[PDB]
Every structure is written in C-alpha cells, then in structure tokens.
Amino acid sequence: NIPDLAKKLGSSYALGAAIDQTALDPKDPHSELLTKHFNSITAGNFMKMDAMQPTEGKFVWSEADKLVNFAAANNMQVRGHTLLWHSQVPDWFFTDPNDPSKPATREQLMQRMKTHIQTIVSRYKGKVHTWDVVNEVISDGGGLRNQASGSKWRDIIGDVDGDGDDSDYIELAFRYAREADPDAVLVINDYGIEGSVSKMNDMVKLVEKLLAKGTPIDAIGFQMHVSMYGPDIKQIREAFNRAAALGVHIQVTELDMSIYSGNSEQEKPVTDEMMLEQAYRYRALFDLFKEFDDRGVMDSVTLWGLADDGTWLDDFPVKGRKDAPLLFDRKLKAKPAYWALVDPSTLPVYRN
Ligand SMILES: [Ca+2]
Prior knowledge:
Layout lengths: L4 H5 L4 E6 L9 H9 L2 E4 L5 H4 L9 H12 L3 E5 L24 H18 L6 E6 L17 H5 L10 H13 L4 E6 L6 H16 L6 E4 L2 E3 L5 H12 L4 E10 L13 H22 L4 E6 L32 H7 L10
This protein binds calcium ion.
C-alpha cells in the first residue's frame, strides 16, 4: 500500500528493473514488486548471447517469450540486454566451424553476428522496444577493446571497408539490428563513462564517427554502477551533457549503488546512517535525471535488480561480500532511498 514508485516520479522516462525468471512467476513476491513499482523490464542474464543461442543455430525462445507475454499483460516496456558482448557469449562464435582450434573468419563472424542479431530482433519486433545492441565495447585502458582487453570481435572482423578505422563490427551490429526492426530504440551501453573523462572521450569519439557514417544509434546507455563514494553528481552531469550534445538520447541502464568503494574493504553491517547517506545520494541522482528528463533526452532509468536479495554486487568485485545497493532491502521492504524518491520530505534537508 506504499506509493507506486514510477508513478510518483512523474517522469517522461520509463522506470525499469533488471530481473531473473522468478519475477515472472505469480507465486513469487518479487513479481508483484516489479509490477507495482516499475513500468519497464530488463533481463539481467537470460537475454545475453549465451542464453539466447547456446549452440550454433539452436535458439532458446522460452524465457524471452515468457518475458514479452508478462510485459504486454502488465503494460510494461522491455529492454533487450544484450545482442553483443565479450562476456557470457558462447566460445563457438569465435572459432572456425570445422576447426575449433582455429579462429573464426571475418566473414564467418560477420555472418554469425547478423544471424544472432536479426533472428532475435525480428522475433521480438514491437514487443521489445529497446536493445542494448552492443555492450562495453570500449577498453578501460583506452580505445576499442581487443584481445588484450577481453574481446575477440575487433581482431577477427577488423577494418571491413578498409577506410583505416576498425569500428566496423560495431557499425554493422547497429545496421543489422535496424534492418530487422525499423522502430526499435538502439543503444550503445557502457560502464565507467559517467566518471572517467578518458573513457567518455573514447565514447564521444566513437559515437561521433559512427553517426557521421549514418549508423542508427539512438542512445548512449550509462550502466551507472556507482558507489556511495562516487562519482560526484557534477562529473556525471558533465558526461550526460557530452552524450546529449551528440544529438542522441541517454539511458541509465544498470543503476546500483554499492556500499563499498572497491575490492579492498571487507564486509560490513548496514546501518541506518549508511542507509540515510545512500538516500541522499539516490535523491541527488534522481534530481540529476530530472534535469535531462526535462530536456526530453532521458529514455529510461533501470535499477540493476529489484531488491538487495538479488544483487550481482554480492559477488562483484568480491565473491561472497554482502552489499546493499538497491531501493528495496533483502526482505523486500522499501529502503530510505525509496522513501526519498516518493516523498522527498522524508529526507531531512536541514538541522538546526
Ligand atoms: Ca572501417
């Protein structure tokens, strides 16, 4: 009987949550949490490349089919995460179909990319409105990812057109997607770009170059894996403005707020003081999101989980370290951060 979160924000942008299949089950209390508070859904893992095509030519439709049925039934949008990545992708993509000990060919990988993207996008035309077409293609160390930075796509496919630039595989992923669905919102998704000037420099250069080629990119997705320690609102606002200045929209795709700064701090108990501070920080973030929503350039904001009982941050970057990153706690109770969003007066903005 608490306020419905998405409704209270009164945003142009959709408010989403990442889920597993259990939130599609009516006998599960996570499902009613999703439909009460959110109007958009992303699959955390079940729409990744390895989940959708575990072996070549054998697509798995059951999970995404159930997702789209649930979403239509409950008047919710769906983001498709993700069509291309360098993690959670089957090994068969990058090896020669007849010699598993040798790499796939430019032509073979291009064709595989096209088949994966188009079979999936075509099936879900008009049911999945938005796709993370590529995920995390920029290295944290500078430039586009290659083998040294965990990805095999660019080394195999390379400079297809021979123009001296090798962003071809990314351009192709977008072109293939648009070809399969003229109406879908096509997103390049990444982490770290909200707080790293050097990484955002690369994102800006990449998107500028792709847009100049007529690449159908609609939005830059900011994962927004932040902590209670940073980055500051000013840094984020700056990165958001750089994205919006390119004429594309922004999406916040994987928002969570770790209680730890990195991997050195050992597990710690959650205190009401910590939760209050998290509430101030979430309030500030949602105030920032409103700035861009008022410009009509924020498409969606998605929390990376419904509640603290299902956060990937319990195992990243430290296996077995309990975090508290989301709007609802481990017993599905609304947290101070939730209360700051629906009733900003619950958050005291003065003392004495
Ligand atoms: Ca090229």
